[PDB]
Coordinates of C-alpha atoms and ligand atoms in Angstrom, one line a residue:
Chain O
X1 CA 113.1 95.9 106.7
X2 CA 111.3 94.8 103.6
X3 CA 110.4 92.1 101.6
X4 CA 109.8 93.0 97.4
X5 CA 106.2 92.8 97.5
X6 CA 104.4 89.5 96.0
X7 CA 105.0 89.0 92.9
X8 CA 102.2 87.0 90.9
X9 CA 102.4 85.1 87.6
X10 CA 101.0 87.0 84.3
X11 CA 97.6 86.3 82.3
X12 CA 100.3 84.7 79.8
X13 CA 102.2 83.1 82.2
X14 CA 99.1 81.8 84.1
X15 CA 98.0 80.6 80.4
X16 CA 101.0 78.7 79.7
X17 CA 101.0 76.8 82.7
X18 CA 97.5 75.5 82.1
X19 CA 97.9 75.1 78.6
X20 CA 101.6 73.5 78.7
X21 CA 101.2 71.8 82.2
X22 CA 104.4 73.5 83.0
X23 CA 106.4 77.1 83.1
X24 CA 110.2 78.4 83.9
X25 CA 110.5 81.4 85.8
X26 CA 114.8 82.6 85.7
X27 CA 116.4 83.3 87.9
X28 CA 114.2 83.8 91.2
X29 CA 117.0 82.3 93.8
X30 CA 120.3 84.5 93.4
X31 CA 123.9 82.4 93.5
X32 CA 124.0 83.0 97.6
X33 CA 120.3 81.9 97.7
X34 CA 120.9 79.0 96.0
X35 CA 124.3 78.2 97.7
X36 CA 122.4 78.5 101.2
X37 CA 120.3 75.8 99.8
X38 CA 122.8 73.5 98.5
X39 CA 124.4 73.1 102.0
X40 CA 120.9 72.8 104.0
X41 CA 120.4 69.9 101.6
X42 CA 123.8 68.4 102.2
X43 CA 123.2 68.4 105.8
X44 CA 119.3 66.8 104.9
X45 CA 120.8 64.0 102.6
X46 CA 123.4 63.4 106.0
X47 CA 121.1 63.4 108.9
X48 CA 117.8 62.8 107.3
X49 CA 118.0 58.7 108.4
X50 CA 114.6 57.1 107.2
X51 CA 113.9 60.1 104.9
X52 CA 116.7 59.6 102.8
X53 CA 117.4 57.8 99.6
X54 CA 120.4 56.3 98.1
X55 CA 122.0 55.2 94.6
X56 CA 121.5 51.1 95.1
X59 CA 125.0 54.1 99.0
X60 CA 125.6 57.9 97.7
X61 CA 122.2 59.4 99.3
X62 CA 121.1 60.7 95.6
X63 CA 117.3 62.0 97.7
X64 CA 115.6 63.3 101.0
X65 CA 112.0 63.9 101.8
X66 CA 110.1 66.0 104.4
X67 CA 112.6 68.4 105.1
X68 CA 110.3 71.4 105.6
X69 CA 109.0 69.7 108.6
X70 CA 113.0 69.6 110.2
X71 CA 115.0 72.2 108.4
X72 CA 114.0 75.7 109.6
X73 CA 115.7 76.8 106.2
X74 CA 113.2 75.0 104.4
X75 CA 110.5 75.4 106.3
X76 CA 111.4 79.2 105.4
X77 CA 111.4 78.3 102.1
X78 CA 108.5 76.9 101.6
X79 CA 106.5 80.4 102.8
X80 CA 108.7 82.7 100.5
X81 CA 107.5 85.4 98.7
X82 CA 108.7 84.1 95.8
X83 CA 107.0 81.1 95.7
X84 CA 103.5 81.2 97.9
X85 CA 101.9 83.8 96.4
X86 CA 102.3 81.9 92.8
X87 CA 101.5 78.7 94.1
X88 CA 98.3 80.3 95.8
X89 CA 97.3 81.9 92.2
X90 CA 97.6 78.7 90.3
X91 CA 95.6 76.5 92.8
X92 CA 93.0 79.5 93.6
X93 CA 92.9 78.8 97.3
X94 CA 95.2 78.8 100.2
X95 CA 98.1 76.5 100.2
X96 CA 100.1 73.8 102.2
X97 CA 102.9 71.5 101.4
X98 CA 101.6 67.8 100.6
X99 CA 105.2 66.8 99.8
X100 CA 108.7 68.0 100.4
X101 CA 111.9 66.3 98.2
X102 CA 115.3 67.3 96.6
X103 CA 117.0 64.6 93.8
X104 CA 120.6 64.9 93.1
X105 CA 121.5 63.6 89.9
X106 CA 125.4 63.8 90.5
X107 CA 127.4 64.5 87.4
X108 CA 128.1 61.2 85.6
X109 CA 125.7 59.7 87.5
X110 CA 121.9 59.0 87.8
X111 CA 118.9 57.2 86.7
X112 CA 116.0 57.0 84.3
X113 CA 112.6 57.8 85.8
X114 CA 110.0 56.1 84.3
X115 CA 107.3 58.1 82.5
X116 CA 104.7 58.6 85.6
X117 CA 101.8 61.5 86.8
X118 CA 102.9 62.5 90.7
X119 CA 98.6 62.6 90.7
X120 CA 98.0 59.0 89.9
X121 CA 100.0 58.2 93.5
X122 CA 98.9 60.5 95.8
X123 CA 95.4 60.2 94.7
X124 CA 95.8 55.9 95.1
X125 CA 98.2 56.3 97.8
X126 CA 97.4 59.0 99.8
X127 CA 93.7 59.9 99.3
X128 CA 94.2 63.4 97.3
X129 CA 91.0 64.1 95.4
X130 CA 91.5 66.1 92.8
X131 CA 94.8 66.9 90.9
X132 CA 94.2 70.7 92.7
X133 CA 97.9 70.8 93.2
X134 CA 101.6 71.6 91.5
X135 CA 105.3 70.9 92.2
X136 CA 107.9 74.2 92.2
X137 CA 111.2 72.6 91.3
X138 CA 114.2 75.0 92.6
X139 CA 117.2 74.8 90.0
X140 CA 120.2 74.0 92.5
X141 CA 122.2 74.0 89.1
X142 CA 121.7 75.2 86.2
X143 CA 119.7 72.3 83.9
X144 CA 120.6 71.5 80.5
X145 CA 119.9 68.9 77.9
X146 CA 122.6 66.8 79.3
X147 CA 122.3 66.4 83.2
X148 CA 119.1 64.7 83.0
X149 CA 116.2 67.5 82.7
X150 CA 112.7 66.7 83.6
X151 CA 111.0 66.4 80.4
X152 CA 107.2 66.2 79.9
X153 CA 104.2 65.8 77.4
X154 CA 103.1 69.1 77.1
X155 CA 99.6 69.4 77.3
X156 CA 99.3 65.8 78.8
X157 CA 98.3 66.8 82.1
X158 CA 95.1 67.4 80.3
X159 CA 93.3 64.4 79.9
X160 CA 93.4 63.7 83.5
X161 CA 95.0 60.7 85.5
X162 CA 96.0 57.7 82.6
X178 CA 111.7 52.7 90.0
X179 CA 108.1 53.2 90.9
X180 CA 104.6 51.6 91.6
X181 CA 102.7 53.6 89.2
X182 CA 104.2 54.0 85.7
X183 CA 102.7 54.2 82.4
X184 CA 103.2 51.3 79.8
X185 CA 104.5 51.8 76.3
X186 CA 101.2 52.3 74.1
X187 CA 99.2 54.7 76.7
X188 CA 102.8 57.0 75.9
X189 CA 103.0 56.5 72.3
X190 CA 100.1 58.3 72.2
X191 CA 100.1 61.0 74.3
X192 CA 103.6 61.6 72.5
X193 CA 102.8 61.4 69.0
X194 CA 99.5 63.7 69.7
X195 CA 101.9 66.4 71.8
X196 CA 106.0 65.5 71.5
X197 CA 108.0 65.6 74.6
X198 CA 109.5 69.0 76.0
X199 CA 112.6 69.2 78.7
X200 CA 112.6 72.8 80.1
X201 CA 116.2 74.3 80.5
X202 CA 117.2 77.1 82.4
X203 CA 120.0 78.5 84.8
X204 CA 120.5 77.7 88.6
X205 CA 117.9 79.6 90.5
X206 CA 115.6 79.3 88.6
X207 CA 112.0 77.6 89.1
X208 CA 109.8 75.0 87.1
X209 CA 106.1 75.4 88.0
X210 CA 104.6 71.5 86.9
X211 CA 101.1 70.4 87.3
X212 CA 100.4 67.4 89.6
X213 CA 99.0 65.5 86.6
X214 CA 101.4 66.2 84.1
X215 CA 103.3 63.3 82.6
X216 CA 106.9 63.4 83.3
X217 CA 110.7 61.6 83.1
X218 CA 113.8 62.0 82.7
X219 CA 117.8 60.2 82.1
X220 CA 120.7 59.8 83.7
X221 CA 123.3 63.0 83.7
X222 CA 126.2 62.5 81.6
X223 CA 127.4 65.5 82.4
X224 CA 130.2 66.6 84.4
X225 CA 128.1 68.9 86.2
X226 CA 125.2 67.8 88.8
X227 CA 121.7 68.6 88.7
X228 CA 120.3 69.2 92.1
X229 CA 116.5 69.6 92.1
X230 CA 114.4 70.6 95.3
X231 CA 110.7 69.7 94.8
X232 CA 107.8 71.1 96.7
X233 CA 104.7 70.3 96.0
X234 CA 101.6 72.5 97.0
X235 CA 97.9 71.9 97.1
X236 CA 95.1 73.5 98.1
X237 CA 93.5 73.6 100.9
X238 CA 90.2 72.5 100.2
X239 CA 92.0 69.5 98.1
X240 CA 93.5 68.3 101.6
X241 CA 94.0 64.9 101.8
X242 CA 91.7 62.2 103.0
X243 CA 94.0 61.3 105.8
X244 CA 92.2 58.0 106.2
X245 CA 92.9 56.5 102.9
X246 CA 96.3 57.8 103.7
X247 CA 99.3 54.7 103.8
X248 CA 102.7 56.9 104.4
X249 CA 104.0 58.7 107.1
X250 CA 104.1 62.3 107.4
X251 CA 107.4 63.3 105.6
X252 CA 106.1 61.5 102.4
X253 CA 102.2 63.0 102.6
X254 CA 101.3 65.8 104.7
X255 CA 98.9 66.0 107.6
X256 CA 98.9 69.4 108.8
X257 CA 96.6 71.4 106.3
X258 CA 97.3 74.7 108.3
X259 CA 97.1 77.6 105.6
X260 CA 100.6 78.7 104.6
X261 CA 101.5 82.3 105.4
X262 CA 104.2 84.5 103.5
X263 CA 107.3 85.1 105.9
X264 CA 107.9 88.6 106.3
X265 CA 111.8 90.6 106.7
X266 CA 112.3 90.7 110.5
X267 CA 115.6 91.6 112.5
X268 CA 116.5 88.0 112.8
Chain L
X1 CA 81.8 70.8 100.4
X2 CA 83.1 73.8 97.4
X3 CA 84.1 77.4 97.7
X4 CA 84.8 78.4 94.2
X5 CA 87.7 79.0 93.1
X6 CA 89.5 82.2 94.5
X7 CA 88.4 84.9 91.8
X8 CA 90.9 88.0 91.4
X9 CA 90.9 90.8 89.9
X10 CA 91.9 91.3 85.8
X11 CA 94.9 93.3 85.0
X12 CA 92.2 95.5 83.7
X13 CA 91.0 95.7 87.0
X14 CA 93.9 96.2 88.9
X15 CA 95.0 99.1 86.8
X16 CA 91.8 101.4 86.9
X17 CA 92.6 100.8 91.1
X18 CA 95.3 101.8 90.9
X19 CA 95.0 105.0 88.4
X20 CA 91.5 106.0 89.6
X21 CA 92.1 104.6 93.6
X22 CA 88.6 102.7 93.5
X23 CA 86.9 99.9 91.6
X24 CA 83.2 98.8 91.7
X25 CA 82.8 95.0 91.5
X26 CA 78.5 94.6 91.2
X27 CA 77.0 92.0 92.7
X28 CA 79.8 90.0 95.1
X29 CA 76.9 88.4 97.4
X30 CA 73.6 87.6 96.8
X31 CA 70.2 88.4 98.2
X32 CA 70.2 86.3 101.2
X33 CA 74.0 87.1 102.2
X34 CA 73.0 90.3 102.5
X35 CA 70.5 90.2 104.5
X36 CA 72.5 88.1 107.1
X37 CA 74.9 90.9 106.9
X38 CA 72.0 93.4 107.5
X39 CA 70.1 91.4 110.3
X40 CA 74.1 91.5 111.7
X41 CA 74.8 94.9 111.2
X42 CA 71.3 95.7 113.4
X43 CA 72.6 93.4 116.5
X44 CA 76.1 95.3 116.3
X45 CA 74.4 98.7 116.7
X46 CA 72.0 97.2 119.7
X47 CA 74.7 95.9 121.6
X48 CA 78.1 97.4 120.4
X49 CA 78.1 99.8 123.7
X50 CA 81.1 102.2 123.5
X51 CA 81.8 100.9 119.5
X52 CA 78.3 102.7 118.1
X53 CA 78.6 106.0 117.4
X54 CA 76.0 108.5 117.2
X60 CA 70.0 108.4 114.6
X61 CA 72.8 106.0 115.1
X62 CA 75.7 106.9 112.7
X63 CA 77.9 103.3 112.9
X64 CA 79.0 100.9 114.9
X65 CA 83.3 100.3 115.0
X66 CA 85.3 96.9 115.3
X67 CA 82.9 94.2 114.6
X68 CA 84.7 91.6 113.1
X69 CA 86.7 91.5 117.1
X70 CA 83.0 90.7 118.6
X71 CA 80.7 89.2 115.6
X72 CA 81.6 85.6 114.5
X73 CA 79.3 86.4 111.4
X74 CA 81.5 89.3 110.3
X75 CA 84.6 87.5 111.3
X76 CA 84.0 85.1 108.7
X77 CA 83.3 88.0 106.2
X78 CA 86.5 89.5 106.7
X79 CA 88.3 85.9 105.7
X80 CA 85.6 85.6 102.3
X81 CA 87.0 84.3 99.5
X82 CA 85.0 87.1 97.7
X83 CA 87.2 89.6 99.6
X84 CA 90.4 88.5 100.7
X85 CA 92.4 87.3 97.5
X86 CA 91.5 90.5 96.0
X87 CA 93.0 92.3 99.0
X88 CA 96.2 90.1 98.7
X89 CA 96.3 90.8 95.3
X90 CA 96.2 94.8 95.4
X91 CA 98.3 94.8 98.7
X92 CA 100.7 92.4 96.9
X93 CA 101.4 90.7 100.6
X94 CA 99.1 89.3 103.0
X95 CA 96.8 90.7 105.0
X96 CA 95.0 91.8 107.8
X97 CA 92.2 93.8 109.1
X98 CA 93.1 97.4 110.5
X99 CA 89.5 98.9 110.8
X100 CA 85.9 97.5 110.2
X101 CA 82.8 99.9 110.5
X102 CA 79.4 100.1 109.6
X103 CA 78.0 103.3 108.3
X104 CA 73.8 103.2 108.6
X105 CA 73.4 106.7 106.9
X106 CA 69.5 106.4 106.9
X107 CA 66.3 107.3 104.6
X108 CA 65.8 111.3 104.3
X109 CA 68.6 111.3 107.0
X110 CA 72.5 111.2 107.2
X111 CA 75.2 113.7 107.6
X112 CA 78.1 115.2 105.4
X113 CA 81.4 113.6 105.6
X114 CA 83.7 116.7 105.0
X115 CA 86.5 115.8 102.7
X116 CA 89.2 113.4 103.7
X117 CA 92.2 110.6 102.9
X118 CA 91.7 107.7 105.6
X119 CA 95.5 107.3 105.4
X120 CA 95.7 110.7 107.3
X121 CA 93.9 109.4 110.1
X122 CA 95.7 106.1 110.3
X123 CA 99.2 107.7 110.1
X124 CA 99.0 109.9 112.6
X125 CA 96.4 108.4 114.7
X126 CA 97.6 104.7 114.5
X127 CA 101.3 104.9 112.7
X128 CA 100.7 103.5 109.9
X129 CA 103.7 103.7 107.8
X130 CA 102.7 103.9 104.4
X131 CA 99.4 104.1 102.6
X132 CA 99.7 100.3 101.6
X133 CA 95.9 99.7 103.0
X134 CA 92.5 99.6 101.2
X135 CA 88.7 99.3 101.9
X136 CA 86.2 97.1 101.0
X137 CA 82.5 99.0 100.9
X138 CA 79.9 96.3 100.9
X139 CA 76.7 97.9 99.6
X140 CA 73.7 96.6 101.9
X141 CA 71.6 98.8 99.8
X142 CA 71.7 99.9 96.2
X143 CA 73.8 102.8 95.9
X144 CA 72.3 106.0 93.6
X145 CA 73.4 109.4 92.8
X146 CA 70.5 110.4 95.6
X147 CA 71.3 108.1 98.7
X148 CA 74.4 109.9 99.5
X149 CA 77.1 107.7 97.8
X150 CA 80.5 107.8 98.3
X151 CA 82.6 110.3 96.4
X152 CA 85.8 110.4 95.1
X153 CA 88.6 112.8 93.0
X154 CA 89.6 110.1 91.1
X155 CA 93.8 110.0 91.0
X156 CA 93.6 112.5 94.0
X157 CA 95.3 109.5 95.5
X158 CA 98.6 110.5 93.6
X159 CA 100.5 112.8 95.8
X160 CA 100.1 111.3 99.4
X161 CA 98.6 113.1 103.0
X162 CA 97.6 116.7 102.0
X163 CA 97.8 118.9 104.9
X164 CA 95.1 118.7 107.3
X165 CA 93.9 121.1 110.4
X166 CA 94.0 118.8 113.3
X168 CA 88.8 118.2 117.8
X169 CA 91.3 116.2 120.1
X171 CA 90.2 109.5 119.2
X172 CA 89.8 110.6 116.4
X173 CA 86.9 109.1 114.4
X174 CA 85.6 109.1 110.6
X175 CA 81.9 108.8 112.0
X176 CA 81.5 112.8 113.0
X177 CA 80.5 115.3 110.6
X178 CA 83.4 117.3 112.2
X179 CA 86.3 115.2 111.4
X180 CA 89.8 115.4 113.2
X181 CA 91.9 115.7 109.4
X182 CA 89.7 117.6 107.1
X183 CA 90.6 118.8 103.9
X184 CA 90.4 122.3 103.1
X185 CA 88.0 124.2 100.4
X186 CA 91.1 125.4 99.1
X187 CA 92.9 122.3 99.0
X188 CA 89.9 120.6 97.4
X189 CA 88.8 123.2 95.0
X190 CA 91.8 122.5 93.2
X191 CA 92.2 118.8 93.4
X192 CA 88.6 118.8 91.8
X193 CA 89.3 121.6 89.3
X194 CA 91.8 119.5 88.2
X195 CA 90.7 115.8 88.3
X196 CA 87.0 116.0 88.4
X197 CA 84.6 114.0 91.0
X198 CA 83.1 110.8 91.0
X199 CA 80.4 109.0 93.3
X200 CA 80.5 105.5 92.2
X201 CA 76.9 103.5 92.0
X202 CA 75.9 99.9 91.4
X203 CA 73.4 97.4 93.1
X204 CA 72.9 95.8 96.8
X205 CA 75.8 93.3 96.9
X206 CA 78.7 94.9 95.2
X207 CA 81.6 96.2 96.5
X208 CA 83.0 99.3 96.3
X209 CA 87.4 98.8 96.5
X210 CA 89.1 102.2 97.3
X211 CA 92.6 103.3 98.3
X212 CA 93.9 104.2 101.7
X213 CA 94.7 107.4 100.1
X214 CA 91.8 108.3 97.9
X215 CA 90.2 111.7 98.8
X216 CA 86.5 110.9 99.4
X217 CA 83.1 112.5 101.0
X218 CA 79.6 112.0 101.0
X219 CA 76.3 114.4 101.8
X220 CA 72.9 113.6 102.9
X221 CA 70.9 110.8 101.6
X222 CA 68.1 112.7 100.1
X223 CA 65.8 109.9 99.4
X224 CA 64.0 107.4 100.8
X225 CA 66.3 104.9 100.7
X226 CA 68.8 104.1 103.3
X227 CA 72.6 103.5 102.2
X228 CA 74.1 100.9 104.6
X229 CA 78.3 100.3 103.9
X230 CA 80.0 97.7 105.2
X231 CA 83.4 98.6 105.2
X232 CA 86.4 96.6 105.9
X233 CA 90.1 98.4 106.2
X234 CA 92.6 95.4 104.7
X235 CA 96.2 96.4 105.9
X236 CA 99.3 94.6 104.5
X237 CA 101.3 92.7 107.1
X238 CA 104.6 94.3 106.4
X239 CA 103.0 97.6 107.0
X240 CA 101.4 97.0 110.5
X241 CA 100.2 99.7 112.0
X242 CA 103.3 100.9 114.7
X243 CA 101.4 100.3 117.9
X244 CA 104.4 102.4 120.1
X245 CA 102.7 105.2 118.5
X246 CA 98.8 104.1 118.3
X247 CA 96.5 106.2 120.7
X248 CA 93.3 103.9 120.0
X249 CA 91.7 101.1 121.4
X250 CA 92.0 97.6 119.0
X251 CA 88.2 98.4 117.9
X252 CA 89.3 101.3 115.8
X253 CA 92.8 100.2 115.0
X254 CA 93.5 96.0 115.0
X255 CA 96.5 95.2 117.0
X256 CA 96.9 91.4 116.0
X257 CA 98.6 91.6 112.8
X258 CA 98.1 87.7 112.1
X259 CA 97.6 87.2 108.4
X260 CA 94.2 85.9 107.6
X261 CA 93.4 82.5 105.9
X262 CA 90.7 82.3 103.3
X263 CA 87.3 81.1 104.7
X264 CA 87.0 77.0 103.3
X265 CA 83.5 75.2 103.2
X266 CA 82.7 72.8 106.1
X267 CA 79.7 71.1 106.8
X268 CA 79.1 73.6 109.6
Ligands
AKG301 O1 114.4 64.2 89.7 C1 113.9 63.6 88.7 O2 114.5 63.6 87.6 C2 112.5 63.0 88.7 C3 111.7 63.2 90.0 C4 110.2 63.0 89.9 O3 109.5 63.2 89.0 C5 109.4 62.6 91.1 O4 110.1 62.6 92.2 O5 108.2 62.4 91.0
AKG302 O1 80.0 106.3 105.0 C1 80.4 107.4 104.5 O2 79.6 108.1 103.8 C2 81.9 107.8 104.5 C3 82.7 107.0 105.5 C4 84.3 107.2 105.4 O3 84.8 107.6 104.4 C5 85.1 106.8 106.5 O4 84.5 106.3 107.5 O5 86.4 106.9 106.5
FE303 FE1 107.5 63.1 89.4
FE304 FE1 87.0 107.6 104.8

């Protein structure tokens, strides 16, 4: 049995994504894929007790679930995705963080502009911004179901509802010097985003939802300095054991 | 503590591999690293026993015994480039050490590696490479390395079958035959590629290659380190050599990070 061999991004590609802070790939999960995904995350957002998080009591997120899900813990080492994460960060990889947000259609909530960096660095002791978030379309994202949107280019001037947001004058310029850009694209496909890249997005008003998984990769030598570390291990990582792609086996 | 970044190869890079079957990168590791490696190299063939073979001609399997070339293997000068050709990860399914001495060495007849590692050790597909670290500079007279470039392109050519095989005789198991080579090199030419002490020499499981005596006096130490993809592991119901010629642990190996030991 085979597995299509590793697919890395292009110079272009690669470009982009340093230059933007961000890139779509189409299409990489088919619809089965993505359906298998959609009910592993179901059963996460209904057994996943402390991990989960609800609409102030619809469970709209879940965290960690690579460390309980063997579907996700799959995930995380597939072809698709390691080999790309290891060419962006330069190094061998692990999973600092593990979530999937459900904006349900009609439903949801603004996210305050905010870099992922600026918390795990204060929070959780990460170093550098060595790291990147692969967000799995679960359905396909539009300008109406709430998009992530960033400052493209923001992520680039380092590290300027949640502890850590950023007021209304550091935005206004970061916006007027780059505008604000929500990538689109249909279910399956990924968005590759810098840890430092300034992000937020709206509510869906949309009769469709928006399901996002989120896994965030960093590199190995940027592990974590697990003594300035406050949160348990389904919000920041501990193990730092080098990732390894799965390979097709008989089971 | 830093490792650079993992370096790759260009797309540049990648495509001469894979039209000509081998790429020189010059000057991987310095000075001082290869001299470690040297000062290695010279304990493996004092005390590799049954691995040397025989001037001594090289030594088999050191990464399994030699911490120092166990790291090597996992270099972040090596290994992302082997993922990156390999397109998976990978492990190691051969490591030798080829002395080939000053005024001395043999000829290594003509031969694909893939052959060998086929039918010795069932390997499934020519989805393998070498590394050749150069512990000495490499010139047209110290017996280099040579290749038909693209003679990779059509898979095994048929071989006559001693009865282990081993690359280190002059009189090799899978040969390939005057006949055989006069046209491969008729039609795409010969090339023994050079460069200085540190580089390394990349070159497909498949490439045709040779080398004759080293003529001068300068010794041309190699390094070489067989990568294997994981999802071709070598099928070890039909292997018929110990795990110092042919790995059996088909872990995938991590990238060496820096630690303050
Ligand atoms: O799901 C969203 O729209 C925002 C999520 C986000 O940026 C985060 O969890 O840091
Ligand atoms: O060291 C040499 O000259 C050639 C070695 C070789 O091609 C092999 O060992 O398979
Ligand atoms: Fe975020
Ligand atoms: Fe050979």
């Amino acid at each position: 049995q085979i597995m299509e061999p590793h697919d890395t991004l292009s110079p272009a590609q690669v470009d982009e994504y340093r230059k933007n802070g961000f890139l779509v790939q189409e299409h990489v999960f088919d619809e089965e894929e993505i359906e298998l995904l959609r009910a592993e995350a179901a059963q996460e957002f209904a057994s996943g007790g402390e991990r989960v998080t609800v609409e102030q009591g619809i469970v709209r997120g879940v965290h960690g679930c690579h460390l309980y899900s063997e579907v996700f813990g799959r995930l995380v080492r597939s072809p698709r995705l390691l080999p790309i994460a290891r060419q962006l960060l330069r190094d061998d990889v692990y999973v600092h963080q593990f979530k999937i947000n459900a904006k349900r259609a009609f439903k949801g909530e603004v996210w305050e502009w905010h870099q992922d960096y600026t918390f795990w660095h204060h929070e959780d002791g990460m170093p550098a911004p060595r790291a990147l978030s692969a967000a799995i379309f679960l359905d396909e994202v539009t300008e109406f179901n709430g998009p992530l949107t960033f400052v493209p280019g923001g992520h680039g001037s380092g590290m300027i509802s949640l502890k850590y947001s950023l007021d209304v004058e550091t935005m206004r310029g970061l916006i007027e010097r780059n505008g604000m850009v929500a990538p689109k694209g249909p279910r399956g496909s990924v968005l590759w985003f810098d840890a430092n890249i300034p992000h937020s997005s709206v509510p869906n008003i949309s009769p469709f939802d928006r399901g996002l998984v989120l896994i965030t990769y960093n590199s190995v030598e940027n592990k974590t300095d697990v003594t300035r570390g406050t949160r348990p291990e389904w919000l920041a990582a501990r193990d730092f054991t080098p990732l390894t792609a799965l390979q097709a086996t008989s089971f």
